[PDB]
Structures are given as C-alpha cells and as structure tokens.
Design a binder for this molecule. Sequence first.
Ligand SMILES: CN1CCN(c2ccc3[nH]c(-c4c(N)c5c(F)cccc5[nH]c4=O)nc3c2)CC1
Length: 289
Amino acid sequence: ELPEDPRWELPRDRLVLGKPLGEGCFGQVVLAEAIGLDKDKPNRVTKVAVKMLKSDATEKDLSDLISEMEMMKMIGKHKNIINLLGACTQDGPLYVIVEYASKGNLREYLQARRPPGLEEQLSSKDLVSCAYQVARGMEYLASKKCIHRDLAARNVLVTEDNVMKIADFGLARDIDYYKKTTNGRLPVKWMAPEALFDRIYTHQSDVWSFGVLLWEIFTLGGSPYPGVPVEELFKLLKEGHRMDKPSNCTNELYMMMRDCWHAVPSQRPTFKQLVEDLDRIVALTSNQE
Ligand SMILES: CN1CCN(c2ccc3[nH]c(-c4c(N)c5c(F)cccc5[nH]c4=O)nc3c2)CC1
C-alpha cells in the first residue's frame, strides 16, 4: 500500500491514457492527457508521459518506480531535464506522470534530420545549441548531487519546441557489459574507464559520457566505435585510444571532446566550465551553414 502526497496527487478521472511510447520488460511509458493539471485552468488538457508497471511486476520493480518519483521530487525543476508533473498513487496502479517530448530521443531526432542521400535541417549554431542545453541540464543535476551514470543521446528527449531534456536521471542504482540496446548498441562505449574498470561513477565520469554525446551530435547520431565488440573496446581504452574528429566539427569542439576524455578524471572540464564555453561558442557559431 502507498501513502498520498497532496503536492503531486492527480485524481484518476483527470488522466486519459493513450498509445504506448515505450516498454521494458521493466515497466512501460504511455502518451496521456491530463485534465486541468495546473491550479488554473482546471479545464485545459496537457499531453503528458505516464510511467507505469507491466503485469509481471514485482515488489522490487514497484520500489524502483517509487524511488524514481521520490528522486525527482527532491531534485526539483529545470527547463533542460524531464520534470515531474503529478502522480496517481491511490486506489490503483502507480502512475508517475512526467514531461512529454513529442520529437523522441536526441539520437532518433538527429538521424531523422541528416542531409539527403546518396523538410527540417539543423545549422551549425543549432547543433552547438543542443550541446549547450544538455550541459545546462547536467550542470543543474550536478548542483543537486545527481550522478546520471548513463548520459547518452538516447537518454535526452526533444520537445515540440526543440528543447533538450535529460531523461532517466532518477533510475534505480541496482550491470552486464555484453548487453546491447534496442538499436543494437553497446552502452559500455559511453563509460569512463574508471567507471568501467573500477566501478567509480562521479560527475567526472558523466563528463566523459558528455564527450561521447558531443561526438553523437556533430556526427548527426553516429554510432560510437562501429563493429567494435566489448573485449576489443577495453584494449582501445587501455592503449589511450580516442574517437576520430567528426567532419563538420570545429577544432575547438573536438579539443572539447578530447578534454572530456582526459585520462585523469580531475583534469577533465566540469559541467559548469562546459556550460560557459558552449555559451560563448553558440554566440560565435554561424546559423548560415
Ligand atoms: C515510431 N516511433 C513511435 C514513437 N516515437 C516516440 C516519439 C516521442 C516520444 N516521447 C517519448 C517519451 C518517453 N519515452 C519518456 C520516458 F521514457 C521517460 C520519461 C519521459 C518520457 N517522455 C516522453 O515524451 N517516447 C516517444 C516515442 C518514436 C517513433
């Protein structure tokens, strides 16, 4: 049984469910319509995302979704993170109501806006702006002592207004290195060597992951290290190997990626330094190409 928090509780008759946005088997996300979410108007509908459990859910799977909601309540609001909007915790299945990003993840979005081969296209100032927002989201998360542990283009969602929002920042701590994603990608490729070989996740290991994220932006949703299996990736990290400079990527932004991949975690930039640099770079980057 669950206790009511009146700050966040939404009556169940105010949530009209819809088409599913994602799956697991670890839970499921659906598209929904929340009636009068805001204090005024109680007659306006907001399109939302509803996190819920599957039929084959256990007490562990349930405590995991509670902790996530609980984490989001503590962390607070930012324009560049997926915010918490409400919850249905009484007399039925637990529904954690979060922000809905109509354009999907940042990898899918970037891939769908690639140049023709072989209706909407992003300029140089556009790509750098995506990097700025994600570093803004991550810096707030860092200010609130949150360590993402899986910062990647896949876990950055995009709104109808082209705002970048960090997602799955509140997920349960609980990893199989040989496991691949839905898109058949190995998540170990976003991991800092200290986190991968010593299990030491810090704000510095998330900075490493931001470096893999930039490479994903300026390659327009490119796959890091294609064809490279798990065991061959460890050898690449031990030799001091680094990814190649994307084409249509400045010397300044590649120097940034490489700094993010500094072998020594203490020597890497902070998100507070990355927000500042990208703030300046956007202002100097051309919107004409
Ligand atoms: C063919 N395909 C159909 C579904 N397409 C799609 C489009 C937008 C989408 N937004 C989210 C979504 C979440 N999955 C989500 C989450 F998992 C945790 C927290 C917040 C979230 N907010 C969302 O808005 N899913 C989407 C799927 C992609 C293309």
